[PDB]
Amino acid sequence: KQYDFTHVPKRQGNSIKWGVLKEKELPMWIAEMDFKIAPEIMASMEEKLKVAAFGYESVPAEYYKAVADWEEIEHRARPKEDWCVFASGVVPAISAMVRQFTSPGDQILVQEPVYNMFYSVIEGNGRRVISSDLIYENSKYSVNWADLEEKLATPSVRMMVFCNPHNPIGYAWSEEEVKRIAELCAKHQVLLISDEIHGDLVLTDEDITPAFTVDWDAKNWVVSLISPSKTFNLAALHAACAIIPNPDLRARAEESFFLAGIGEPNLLAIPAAIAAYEEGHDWLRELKQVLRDNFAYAREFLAKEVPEVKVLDSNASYLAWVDISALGMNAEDFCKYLREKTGLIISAGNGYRGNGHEFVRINLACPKELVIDGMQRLKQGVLNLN
Amino acid sequence: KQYDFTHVPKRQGNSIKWGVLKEKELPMWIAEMDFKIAPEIMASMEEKLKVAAFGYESVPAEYYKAVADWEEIEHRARPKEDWCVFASGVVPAISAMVRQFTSPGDQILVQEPVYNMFYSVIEGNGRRVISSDLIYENSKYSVNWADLEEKLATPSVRMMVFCNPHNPIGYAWSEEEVKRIAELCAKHQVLLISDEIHGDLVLTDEDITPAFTVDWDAKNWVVSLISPSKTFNLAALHAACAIIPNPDLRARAEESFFLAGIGEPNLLAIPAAIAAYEEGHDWLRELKQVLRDNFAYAREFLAKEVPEVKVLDSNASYLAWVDISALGMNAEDFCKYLREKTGLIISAGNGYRGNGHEFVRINLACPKELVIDGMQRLKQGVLNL
Ligand SMILES: [Ca+2]
Ligand SMILES: [Ca+2]
Ligand SMILES: [Cl-]
Ligand SMILES: [Cl-]
């Protein structure tokens, strides 16, 4: 390989993932990777530090050009650069747009189970979550299209937060799916906020369909949100981008980002994001193969060794979604037991709502040696359930 | 000198201060310095980059300890470490608190002329600015205390955004003034948001009185906002700290920061702020020597060579507030003219409201040679009018 995917980066003491651990505990919960970032990103960060003065920065045209170039090359989906607006994070941009584009008490639609932060930003802002729950049958999730449309058609339903690809299930929607969702939203005058943060991590020979690509009959109703954070192991960089084709919505979102204090870059966001999006292609290619290898190992190991659990077929993300229903234990209980008995720390599905209490989420973006250790621990934990 | 106050940092192309300038142009407008940062802070940033993976960060106890040690050493005012809450920036924290601690339509009190971004975050959020204007007489500003109180006691006036020290005028309020303002707010059930971002830049023997030092029960109505950003030339670091003695108000503020997306540090904020506040004392000491020398030169030069303008007396900040009323030109017009004629770029007072249309603001946090150049350009501008 061209890059290092074998050694775990040594963190400083205030790391969430690696701080405040007990001896020999193995964290596989929170969505950050245990790989070094692309050295091309590191080089840009080092060069920027050498300025040795960190005053106010603008977002340059080159930022948006980088975003468009990356989407073109990786997804054959080139947005117009004028559509693009810097924000310091995806979830903060969602929070700002909740406040700008809905009123207190309004309902915002999601598809449960889904990323727990969506509930926080909706409910924390005094909006109300409504779900069109994903249907779970024969170990796969699907949409109830009539139920989704009925809910979208509700007067008080004003926005849809769409996870594309969908976390935690790891599903990159088909083109026809994304188009149908956009069409339904536009039809019912519902803003479609498409959170595309996992969009570079499709592991099959498929690709995402960014919301911004939909036909002009619906394109004015959509916002696509992307960031290098998940793709490149840069949660703390605080660089993201909203892609908003409608100019009036775009102006208003931009104002909302400035109000929230999320519209101006920190001292690294610009050079580091530009380096990721212009020079990170090769590193990503290699990462995807490391991830495929890890998922293949996990799937084979659990199928053969722990038939009590079922790793869902998923096509995107570095997070495995594992049906633990056959164990007959609430996931929160199971994960607490597992950590106590084995030191393995994985995420309980409960906070994703939907049917999440029957699932655990396992982060596989780590060296193979850590995956092996974790699988062994998970097995021992299930075996010891007596 | 132990540290470098003579070379201007060479910026990348997206710098606001230096970014789009004509050859020859001399920017002395926006409040960032033309000095390299303390090497101790650079060292901490370099060390952090070694991690080469930048996942999620907590705020360590060491961060609050650093803040408290800094305040103790530099201001003789140690906060309890428990009072402290990280935020990604002072203005963004003010914005969050406007939304959490007031309702749409409420009035938020300032003292004009004052930092223009206070108006943006009040009005943008759908609150209404109200001012108790600072009275300008005999080349000095003062407070109209009866007017201030009348406004604070108005039912719809819910918060005061208090600039301590006051930008753009450069005034570090006395202990008695800060205590009085806090009392007035508390008595009238108004939250005092004390923006203390210029507090480490008092250039006289005077020192700031942080709002968190006021006696109980007024103390339960105050929030002190600090940051290494102005002190250390770190605006883009996005590290700040709210100091909030009232535990319930503090928890609510923290919640508001997370809700807005400004509660989580970026991948440099923690080590860099810790370095600044633990190891930055000697650099700051030397900086104040250079700033005093710069101000002394500007005052001497303008008194002798440009009697048509008047630099107001100020005890804090690296920004000079200069009365240009004798020129008989709106400040915005004069600054445009000045830039065209001489290439000097200074801030028109208009945007600070109050009586700012009669003033210009000049940033003196640059090498002495740039100050000498800029003062000469100013002279050239004024005399050629
Ligand atoms: Ca193929
Ligand atoms: Ca076996
Ligand atoms: Cl709207
Ligand atoms: Cl309140």
Short mmCIF file of C-alpha atoms in Angstrom, two decimals, chain A residues 14-349:
data_model
loop_
_atom_site.label_atom_id
_atom_site.label_comp_id
_atom_site.label_asym_id
_atom_site.label_seq_id
_atom_site.Cartn_x
_atom_site.Cartn_y
_atom_site.Cartn_z
CA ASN A 14 -8.72 14.69 25.58
CA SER A 15 -9.72 12.25 22.80
CA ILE A 16 -13.34 11.08 23.22
CA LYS A 17 -12.65 7.71 21.58
CA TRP A 18 -9.42 6.96 23.45
CA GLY A 19 -9.55 9.14 26.57
CA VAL A 20 -10.83 7.92 29.91
CA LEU A 21 -10.49 4.26 29.01
CA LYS A 22 -9.74 1.48 31.42
CA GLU A 23 -6.90 -0.98 30.84
CA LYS A 24 -7.05 -2.93 27.64
CA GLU A 25 -10.49 -1.54 26.66
CA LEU A 26 -11.12 -1.46 22.93
CA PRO A 27 -13.30 1.34 21.59
CA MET A 28 -15.29 0.59 18.49
CA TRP A 29 -18.25 2.92 19.10
CA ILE A 30 -17.90 6.51 18.00
CA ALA A 31 -17.53 7.25 14.31
CA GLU A 32 -13.91 8.32 13.95
CA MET A 33 -11.19 6.17 12.42
CA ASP A 34 -8.02 4.67 13.89
CA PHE A 35 -6.03 5.52 10.81
CA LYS A 36 -3.66 8.31 10.11
CA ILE A 37 -4.95 11.00 7.75
CA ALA A 38 -3.69 11.38 4.18
CA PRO A 39 -0.24 12.86 4.22
CA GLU A 40 -1.26 15.30 1.50
CA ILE A 41 -3.67 16.80 4.08
CA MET A 42 -0.99 16.84 6.75
CA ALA A 43 1.36 18.69 4.40
CA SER A 44 -1.22 21.43 3.80
CA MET A 45 -1.83 21.80 7.52
CA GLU A 46 1.90 22.04 8.29
CA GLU A 47 2.36 24.70 5.59
CA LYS A 48 -0.52 26.74 6.95
CA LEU A 49 0.88 26.67 10.46
CA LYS A 50 4.01 28.26 9.21
CA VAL A 51 2.17 31.49 8.56
CA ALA A 52 2.49 31.91 12.35
CA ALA A 53 -0.41 34.40 12.55
CA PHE A 54 -4.03 33.35 12.47
CA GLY A 55 -6.30 36.28 11.70
CA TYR A 56 -9.59 36.38 9.89
CA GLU A 57 -10.03 34.31 6.75
CA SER A 58 -12.48 34.33 3.94
CA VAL A 59 -13.73 31.26 2.10
CA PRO A 60 -11.97 31.42 -1.25
CA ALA A 61 -13.36 30.39 -4.61
CA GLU A 62 -10.84 27.54 -4.56
CA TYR A 63 -12.76 25.88 -1.71
CA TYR A 64 -15.92 25.53 -3.76
CA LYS A 65 -13.93 24.53 -6.87
CA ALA A 66 -12.36 21.75 -4.83
CA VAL A 67 -15.80 20.63 -3.60
CA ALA A 68 -17.09 20.56 -7.21
CA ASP A 69 -13.99 18.79 -8.55
CA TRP A 70 -14.25 16.14 -5.85
CA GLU A 71 -17.95 15.50 -6.50
CA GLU A 72 -17.27 15.32 -10.23
CA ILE A 73 -14.42 12.85 -9.94
CA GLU A 74 -15.77 10.66 -7.15
CA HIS A 75 -19.50 10.77 -8.02
CA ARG A 76 -19.76 12.03 -11.63
CA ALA A 77 -21.91 14.72 -10.14
CA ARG A 78 -20.51 18.17 -10.53
CA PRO A 79 -22.37 20.88 -8.65
CA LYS A 80 -22.28 24.46 -9.73
CA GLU A 81 -19.78 26.28 -7.56
CA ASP A 82 -22.26 29.14 -6.97
CA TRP A 83 -24.52 26.68 -5.23
CA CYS A 84 -21.91 26.07 -2.52
CA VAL A 85 -21.82 27.64 0.97
CA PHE A 86 -19.23 26.94 3.69
CA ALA A 87 -20.42 25.77 7.11
CA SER A 88 -18.25 24.50 9.98
CA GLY A 89 -20.27 21.30 10.29
CA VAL A 90 -23.11 19.27 8.87
CA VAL A 91 -25.16 18.93 12.07
CA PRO A 92 -24.71 22.61 12.96
CA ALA A 93 -25.86 23.58 9.43
CA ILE A 94 -28.96 21.39 9.94
CA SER A 95 -29.61 23.07 13.32
CA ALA A 96 -29.36 26.54 11.69
CA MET A 97 -31.69 25.56 8.86
CA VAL A 98 -34.25 24.10 11.30
CA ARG A 99 -34.44 27.52 12.95
CA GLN A 100 -34.51 29.44 9.63
CA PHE A 101 -36.93 27.33 7.61
CA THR A 102 -39.45 26.04 10.16
CA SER A 103 -41.29 27.45 13.16
CA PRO A 104 -41.39 26.16 16.77
CA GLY A 105 -43.75 23.20 16.99
CA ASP A 106 -43.51 22.31 13.32
CA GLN A 107 -42.83 18.69 12.45
CA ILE A 108 -39.68 17.53 10.73
CA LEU A 109 -39.69 14.12 9.07
CA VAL A 110 -37.04 11.45 9.38
CA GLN A 111 -36.82 7.75 8.58
CA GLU A 112 -36.14 5.80 11.77
CA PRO A 113 -33.83 4.29 12.80
CA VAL A 114 -31.44 7.13 11.92
CA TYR A 115 -28.52 9.12 13.27
CA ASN A 116 -29.25 10.21 16.80
CA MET A 117 -28.08 13.78 16.26
CA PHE A 118 -31.10 14.40 13.96
CA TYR A 119 -33.36 14.00 17.03
CA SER A 120 -31.18 16.32 19.06
CA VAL A 121 -31.22 19.12 16.50
CA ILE A 122 -34.91 18.81 15.82
CA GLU A 123 -36.13 18.43 19.41
CA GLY A 124 -33.46 20.71 20.96
CA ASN A 125 -34.70 23.44 18.70
CA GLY A 126 -38.35 22.90 19.70
CA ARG A 127 -39.46 21.15 16.56
CA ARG A 128 -41.17 17.77 16.59
CA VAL A 129 -39.91 14.59 15.11
CA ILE A 130 -42.16 12.62 12.86
CA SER A 131 -40.98 9.35 11.36
CA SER A 132 -41.94 7.30 8.43
CA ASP A 133 -40.28 4.25 9.96
CA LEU A 134 -38.23 2.07 7.64
CA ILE A 135 -39.87 -1.38 7.23
CA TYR A 136 -37.61 -4.15 8.52
CA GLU A 137 -38.30 -7.56 7.05
CA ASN A 138 -36.07 -10.44 5.93
CA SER A 139 -33.01 -8.61 7.38
CA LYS A 140 -33.43 -5.60 5.10
CA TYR A 141 -35.00 -2.18 5.47
CA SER A 142 -37.33 -0.59 2.92
CA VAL A 143 -39.52 2.56 2.58
CA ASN A 144 -43.34 2.56 3.00
CA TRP A 145 -43.91 5.03 0.21
CA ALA A 146 -47.63 5.63 0.95
CA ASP A 147 -46.87 6.31 4.61
CA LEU A 148 -44.01 8.64 3.67
CA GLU A 149 -46.18 10.62 1.24
CA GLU A 150 -49.06 10.90 3.72
CA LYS A 151 -46.77 12.35 6.33
CA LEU A 152 -45.02 14.71 3.92
CA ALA A 153 -48.47 15.91 2.83
CA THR A 154 -49.30 16.93 6.41
CA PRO A 155 -49.46 20.76 6.70
CA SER A 156 -47.31 20.87 9.84
CA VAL A 157 -44.59 18.73 8.21
CA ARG A 158 -42.27 21.37 6.80
CA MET A 159 -38.84 19.72 6.36
CA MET A 160 -37.41 16.27 5.78
CA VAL A 161 -33.90 15.36 7.07
CA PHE A 162 -32.81 12.60 4.73
CA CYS A 163 -29.72 10.55 5.48
CA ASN A 164 -28.07 9.74 2.19
CA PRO A 165 -26.34 7.32 2.69
CA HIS A 166 -28.40 6.32 5.68
CA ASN A 167 -26.80 5.90 9.06
CA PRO A 168 -26.84 3.63 10.95
CA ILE A 169 -28.03 1.02 8.48
CA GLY A 170 -25.33 1.86 5.94
CA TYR A 171 -27.56 2.27 2.87
CA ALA A 172 -26.73 4.34 -0.15
CA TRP A 173 -30.11 4.93 -1.81
CA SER A 174 -30.66 4.23 -5.49
CA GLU A 175 -31.01 6.97 -7.98
CA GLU A 176 -34.71 6.20 -8.37
CA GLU A 177 -35.13 6.33 -4.55
CA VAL A 178 -33.46 9.66 -4.17
CA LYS A 179 -35.42 11.12 -7.10
CA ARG A 180 -38.74 9.81 -5.76
CA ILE A 181 -38.03 11.30 -2.29
CA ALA A 182 -37.18 14.68 -3.81
CA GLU A 183 -40.25 14.60 -6.01
CA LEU A 184 -42.49 13.85 -3.00
CA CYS A 185 -40.97 16.68 -0.98
CA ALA A 186 -41.26 19.24 -3.79
CA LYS A 187 -44.87 18.09 -4.44
CA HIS A 188 -45.81 18.83 -0.87
CA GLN A 189 -43.66 21.95 -0.47
CA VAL A 190 -41.34 20.25 2.01
CA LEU A 191 -37.67 21.21 2.14
CA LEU A 192 -35.37 18.23 1.58
CA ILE A 193 -32.16 18.42 3.63
CA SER A 194 -29.95 15.58 2.36
CA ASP A 195 -27.13 14.74 4.74
CA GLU A 196 -24.50 13.19 2.44
CA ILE A 197 -21.65 12.93 4.95
CA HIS A 198 -21.18 9.17 4.29
CA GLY A 199 -21.40 9.60 0.53
CA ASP A 200 -17.72 8.97 -0.18
CA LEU A 201 -17.78 5.71 1.72
CA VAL A 202 -19.88 3.53 -0.62
CA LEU A 203 -18.01 0.24 -0.60
CA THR A 204 -19.88 -1.66 -3.35
CA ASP A 205 -19.70 -0.85 -7.08
CA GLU A 206 -22.43 1.69 -6.69
CA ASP A 207 -22.50 5.37 -6.13
CA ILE A 208 -24.56 7.86 -4.35
CA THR A 209 -27.08 10.14 -6.00
CA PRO A 210 -26.63 13.57 -4.38
CA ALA A 211 -29.86 15.42 -3.89
CA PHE A 212 -28.49 18.38 -5.85
CA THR A 213 -28.60 16.25 -9.01
CA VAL A 214 -32.37 15.86 -9.12
CA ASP A 215 -34.43 17.36 -11.95
CA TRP A 216 -35.38 21.05 -11.83
CA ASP A 217 -38.95 20.10 -11.06
CA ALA A 218 -37.66 19.37 -7.48
CA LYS A 219 -34.13 20.73 -7.41
CA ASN A 220 -35.28 24.06 -5.90
CA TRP A 221 -36.44 22.20 -2.78
CA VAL A 222 -33.15 20.47 -1.88
CA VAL A 223 -30.05 21.10 0.15
CA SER A 224 -27.05 18.69 -0.01
CA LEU A 225 -24.64 18.69 2.93
CA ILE A 226 -21.13 17.24 2.60
CA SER A 227 -17.91 17.37 4.58
CA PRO A 228 -14.48 15.78 4.55
CA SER A 229 -14.92 14.81 8.20
CA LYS A 230 -16.16 11.27 7.93
CA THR A 231 -14.31 10.39 4.79
CA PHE A 232 -10.88 11.60 5.85
CA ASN A 233 -10.95 11.24 9.70
CA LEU A 234 -11.35 14.94 10.32
CA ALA A 235 -14.25 15.28 12.77
CA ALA A 236 -12.40 18.10 14.56
CA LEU A 237 -11.44 20.07 11.42
CA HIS A 238 -14.87 21.75 11.27
CA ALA A 239 -15.14 22.12 7.51
CA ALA A 240 -18.30 21.36 5.60
CA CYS A 241 -20.26 22.60 2.67
CA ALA A 242 -23.95 23.11 1.86
CA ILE A 243 -24.93 22.79 -1.81
CA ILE A 244 -28.12 24.71 -2.40
CA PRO A 245 -29.28 25.23 -6.01
CA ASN A 246 -32.12 27.66 -5.20
CA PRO A 247 -30.52 31.12 -4.78
CA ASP A 248 -33.06 32.52 -2.35
CA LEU A 249 -32.83 29.46 -0.06
CA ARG A 250 -29.08 29.63 -0.40
CA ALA A 251 -28.91 33.28 0.70
CA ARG A 252 -31.14 32.57 3.66
CA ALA A 253 -29.13 29.47 4.71
CA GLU A 254 -25.92 31.46 4.46
CA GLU A 255 -27.40 34.17 6.74
CA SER A 256 -28.44 31.41 9.17
CA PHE A 257 -24.89 30.03 9.27
CA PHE A 258 -23.47 33.47 10.05
CA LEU A 259 -26.03 33.92 12.88
CA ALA A 260 -25.10 30.60 14.40
CA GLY A 261 -21.40 31.46 14.22
CA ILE A 262 -20.67 28.57 11.82
CA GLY A 263 -20.09 30.43 8.58
CA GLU A 264 -16.41 31.43 9.00
CA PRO A 265 -13.48 29.00 8.77
CA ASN A 266 -11.03 28.23 11.45
CA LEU A 267 -7.26 28.41 10.72
CA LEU A 268 -7.07 24.95 9.06
CA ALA A 269 -10.52 24.33 7.55
CA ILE A 270 -9.74 25.88 4.18
CA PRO A 271 -6.28 24.49 3.27
CA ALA A 272 -6.99 21.07 4.82
CA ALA A 273 -10.34 20.64 3.04
CA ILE A 274 -8.90 21.79 -0.28
CA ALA A 275 -6.03 19.27 0.10
CA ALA A 276 -8.49 16.46 0.98
CA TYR A 277 -10.77 17.22 -1.95
CA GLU A 278 -7.99 17.82 -4.55
CA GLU A 279 -5.44 15.23 -3.41
CA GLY A 280 -7.23 12.64 -1.34
CA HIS A 281 -8.49 10.34 -4.08
CA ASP A 282 -5.72 7.77 -3.84
CA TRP A 283 -5.88 7.59 -0.09
CA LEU A 284 -9.64 7.04 -0.22
CA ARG A 285 -9.25 4.28 -2.80
CA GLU A 286 -6.91 2.41 -0.41
CA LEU A 287 -9.14 3.09 2.64
CA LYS A 288 -12.09 1.54 0.86
CA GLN A 289 -10.20 -1.69 0.31
CA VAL A 290 -9.09 -1.78 3.97
CA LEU A 291 -12.73 -1.29 4.94
CA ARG A 292 -13.97 -4.00 2.54
CA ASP A 293 -11.40 -6.38 3.96
CA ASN A 294 -12.50 -5.60 7.51
CA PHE A 295 -16.21 -5.98 6.74
CA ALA A 296 -15.47 -9.29 4.92
CA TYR A 297 -13.57 -10.56 7.99
CA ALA A 298 -16.31 -9.40 10.40
CA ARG A 299 -19.09 -10.92 8.29
CA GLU A 300 -17.34 -14.24 7.89
CA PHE A 301 -16.24 -14.42 11.46
CA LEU A 302 -19.70 -13.63 12.92
CA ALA A 303 -21.54 -15.92 10.50
CA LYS A 304 -19.30 -18.84 11.46
CA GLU A 305 -18.74 -18.07 15.15
CA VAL A 306 -21.72 -16.10 16.44
CA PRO A 307 -24.87 -17.17 14.58
CA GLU A 308 -26.86 -15.45 17.32
CA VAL A 309 -26.17 -12.11 15.65
CA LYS A 310 -26.66 -10.91 12.06
CA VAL A 311 -24.54 -8.27 10.32
CA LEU A 312 -26.77 -6.44 7.89
CA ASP A 313 -25.90 -6.29 4.27
CA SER A 314 -24.98 -2.67 3.86
CA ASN A 315 -23.31 -0.91 0.98
CA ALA A 316 -21.96 2.24 2.62
CA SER A 317 -20.10 3.58 5.62
CA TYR A 318 -17.58 2.04 7.97
CA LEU A 319 -20.18 1.18 10.59
CA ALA A 320 -21.68 -2.29 10.83
CA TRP A 321 -25.31 -2.58 11.93
CA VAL A 322 -25.80 -5.85 13.71
CA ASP A 323 -29.17 -7.47 14.53
CA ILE A 324 -28.86 -8.92 18.02
CA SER A 325 -32.57 -9.82 18.42
CA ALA A 326 -31.75 -13.53 18.65
CA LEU A 327 -29.77 -12.84 21.88
CA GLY A 328 -33.00 -11.72 23.51
CA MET A 329 -31.42 -8.71 25.24
CA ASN A 330 -31.94 -4.95 24.85
CA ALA A 331 -28.90 -3.56 23.07
CA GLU A 332 -28.11 -1.06 25.88
CA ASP A 333 -27.92 -3.97 28.36
CA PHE A 334 -25.84 -6.07 26.01
CA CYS A 335 -23.32 -3.35 25.31
CA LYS A 336 -22.86 -2.57 29.00
CA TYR A 337 -22.37 -6.32 29.71
CA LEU A 338 -19.95 -6.65 26.81
CA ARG A 339 -17.81 -3.77 27.97
CA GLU A 340 -17.74 -5.10 31.53
CA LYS A 341 -16.97 -8.69 30.56
CA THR A 342 -14.60 -8.04 27.67
CA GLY A 343 -13.53 -4.40 27.46
CA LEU A 344 -15.06 -4.08 23.98
CA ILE A 345 -16.98 -0.85 23.62
CA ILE A 346 -19.59 -0.79 20.84
CA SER A 347 -22.69 1.37 20.36
CA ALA A 348 -26.14 0.30 21.43
CA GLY A 349 -28.74 0.92 18.76
#
